[PDB]
Amino acid sequence: SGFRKMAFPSGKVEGCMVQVTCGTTTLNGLWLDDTVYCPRHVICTAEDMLNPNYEDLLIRKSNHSFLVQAGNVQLRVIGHSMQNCLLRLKVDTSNPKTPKYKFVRIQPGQTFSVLACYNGSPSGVYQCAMRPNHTIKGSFLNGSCGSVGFNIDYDCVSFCYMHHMELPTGVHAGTDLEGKFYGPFVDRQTAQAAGTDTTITLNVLAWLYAAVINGDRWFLNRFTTTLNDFNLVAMKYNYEPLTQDHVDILGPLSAQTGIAVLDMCAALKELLQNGMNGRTILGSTILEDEFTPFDVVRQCSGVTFQ
Amino acid sequence: SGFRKMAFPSGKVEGCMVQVTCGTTTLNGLWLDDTVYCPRHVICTAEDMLNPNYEDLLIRKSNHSFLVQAGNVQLRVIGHSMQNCLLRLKVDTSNPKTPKYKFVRIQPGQTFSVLACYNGSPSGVYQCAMRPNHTIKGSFLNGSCGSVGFNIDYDCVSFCYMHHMELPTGVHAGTDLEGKFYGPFVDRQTAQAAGTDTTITLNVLAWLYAAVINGDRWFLNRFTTTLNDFNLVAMKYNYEPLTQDHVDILGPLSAQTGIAVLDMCAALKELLQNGMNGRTILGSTILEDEFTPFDVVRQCSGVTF
Secondary structure (H helix, E strand, C coil): CCCCCCCCCHHHHHCEEEEEEEEEEEEEEEEEEEEEEHHHHHCCCCHHHHCCHHHHHHCCHHHHHEEECCEEEEEEEEEEECCCCEEEEEEEECCCCEEEECCCCCCCCCEEEEEEEEEEEEEEEEEECCCCCCCCCCCCCCCCCCCCEEEECCCEEEEEEEEECCCCCCCCCEEEECCECCCCCCCCCCCCCCCCCEEHHHHHHHHHHHHCCCCCCCCCCCCHHHHHHHHHHHHHECCCCCHHHHHHHCHHHHHHHHHCCCHHEEEEEHHHHCCCCCECCCCCCCCCCCCCHHHHHHHHHCCCCC | CCCCCEECCCHHHHHHEEEECCCEEEEEEEEEEEEEEEEHHHHHHHHHCCCHHHHHHHHCCCCCHHEECCEEEEEEEEEEEECCEEEEEEECCCCCCEEEEEEEECCCCEEEEEEECCEEEEEEEEECCCCCCCCCCCCCCCCCCCCEEEEEEECEEEEEEEEECCCCCCCCCCCCCCCCCCCCCCCCCCCCCCCCCCCCCCHHHHHHHHHHHHCCCCCCCCCCCHHHHHHHHHHCEEEEECCHHHHCCCCCCCCCHCCCCCHHHHHHHHHHHHCCCCCCEECEECCCCCHHHHHHHHEEEEEEC
């Protein structure tokens, strides 16, 4: 029983964190096998970030312009190249702690664990969701660039995010491990701003199912609703439009609890219109949207209290 | 930059988790050097919990009765004993991944990270607090027994919790690493239940300081209050009584912000009596009580391990 915003164990990722320095800038790098991945802006000086031409700035560097350190030990870079917004540094030795892994680009609404690091050392781990607007509401301080987001399936680590910057509102932006930004953001100092955001409807529904699985159903009702009728209401509350695909995804959860998806949508509709009246769901006073249906199934019992 | 309730990196602990099987009962064990620690009820069965005599039950067991598995390797048990509510199994191999560590008994209100494990395999990690009523609001499923709670100091891991059971309200109970339960709970079938719980005032105050440190300070005012007047109000909202010791524990934060603890109490009093008026503190609509004064400094400063 119980329900927490839990992250994946971070050990497999901790063993891949290193420090990367160029000039006076230092940040984190991801060391897999004989390669180290890090934000390309590590090569930028103060004035460079205003309007940097990375191709021009990088061609002026050599392998020895980069100082990679695993702990206090230096790793000799024997090659370098740029891949979109990331730098790929080849080193003269392999990381024996490299776990089975793959590079994946996630979709907004999905969740992942983040191992916040500073100077190549782990600070903490937390779970979050990529907002529909591609930003993440993380906890990063200066020097956290290069920290990565990931998910773990069995013993295979799927890296999906590398931290690059913080926007005006205090939210964060980054890229996948191929160096491609999530969102319209760019790695330079400009008037960038997070776009409009919405609540991840699919996740809120998944969360309501988690509550039922855990024995609570005070928010249910005798009504049902049309997908369209639900969206007409939900969209008024800044909720992401729900599609048939989302409904289908909730199938397993629906089957385990005996509550039809549209019936749960009817419950959510009522919660949005009438509020929670001082009550709580899984200990929360607000509707949580950082748990995907997959997260709920993974954390909750396969058998509902009843 | 945001404020997230985060857990300690779990790598050092993951390397110590193993599976302990006894007959049809399987749970998790903590392998440090050549000893594996796990809940003693691993020598029980469904019926064995409703009235155990661990003393007698353990006698019918010998070294080969215990199967310890670390990864895909079998750890040969060469000795065994019981320490309070724990089983101590001596194995023929000292864990190559044993970190610097210590066993500590946490106090009510203090937090720690929990590494949920099943069949010796870590599945997730989350932060939680030892509630004033001696239970923890964790997330555990069958097979999680043996999972541990911990804190990290530089390079030293302080183990403070080992999971043993779930109470009727869905909350959890366990022991320190010496096998002594937190609270009055026992590893047996009884009518035991969690008592009433209160909000951890010390932590709520620590969190308000965190908010201030992060620039969220709209709730501060130019007044103060006596400790007694604060408690008269706080206790009406089911908050733990604030003690002079708590005030002193908040000293570093108070010094850092230049806001006296009692001045912060005045702020909190107003928040409890008038609410937030639709405002947010560190993006939250409620007062968080699972961040200790130590967690705040840790996260606001860039402490790494």
